[PDB]
């Protein structure tokens, strides 16, 4: 249910795991991509104009 | 009513447990049974007391017990 049980089923695998590049457990196996280390569709490193607040 | 003196004391061995039996009569003279099964008990201040058992005689078969003694033990021997 929308309350706590919504958190219940949450024992399965992380939808983002250790991507081999940036040391962040953020590799979306399901999308065949890392949203952190950029490995998967950019040869270049994922970097943005807004890594922070300017 | 006070107990005068003891006359009967046997020894019986039940369920892997020691068991003593005592019989005596009060000053009113009624015969009442005494159940006691423990040899050790912490003295207050401050030792251990050993229950004496030298004069007790050993009973090994049920009907060897006096008939009246036996016919009351049934209500109790279940829950030793």
């Amino acid at each position: 249910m929308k309350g706590t049980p919504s958190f219940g089923k949450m024992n399965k695998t992380p939808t983002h795991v250790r991507c081999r590049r940036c040391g962040r457990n953020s590799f979306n196996a399901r999308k065949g991509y890392c949203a952190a280390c950029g490995f998967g569709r950019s040869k270049k490193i994922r970097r943005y104009s807004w890594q922070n607040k300017k | 009513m006070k107990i005068s003196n003891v006359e009967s004391k046997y020894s019986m061995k039940v369920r892997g447990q020691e068991l003593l039996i005592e019989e005596a009569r009060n000053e009113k003279g009624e015969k009442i049974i005494i159940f006691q099964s423990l040899t050790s008990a912490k003295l207050l201040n401050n030792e251990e007391w050993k229950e004496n058992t030298t004069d007790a005689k050993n009973v090994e078969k049920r009907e060897d017990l006096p008939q009246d003694v036996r016919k009351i033990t049934g209500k109790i021997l279940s829950l030793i």
């Binding site: - | 009513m1 107990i3 005592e22 423990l38 003295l43 207050l44 829950l79």
Partner: protein, 75 residues
């Protein structure tokens, strides 16, 4: 000198019952320590399980209304 009796006493479990069902058996044996000191100056009360056992052939809440006791109250 206290009378080192081989005495037999009769107890009445009247007061213990009539109140909380859930507590009787403990109060029962606890009541046992009451008179034994009172009528024999007991400093510490050592009860054989059997003479204690018979009060509860029942578990929680059924208790015989009376019982006989024998005491070899050593020093």
């Amino acid at each position: 000198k206290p009378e080192k009796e081989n005495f037999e006493m009769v107890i009445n479990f009247r007061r213990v019952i009539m109140g909380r069902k859930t507590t009787r058996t403990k109060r029962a044996i606890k009541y046992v320590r009451y008179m034994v000191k009172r009528h024999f100056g007991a400093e510490k009360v050592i009860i054989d399980p059997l003479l204690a056992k018979a009060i509860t052939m029942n578990g929680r809440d059924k208790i015989v209304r009376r019982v006989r006791i024998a005491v070899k109250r050593i020093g």
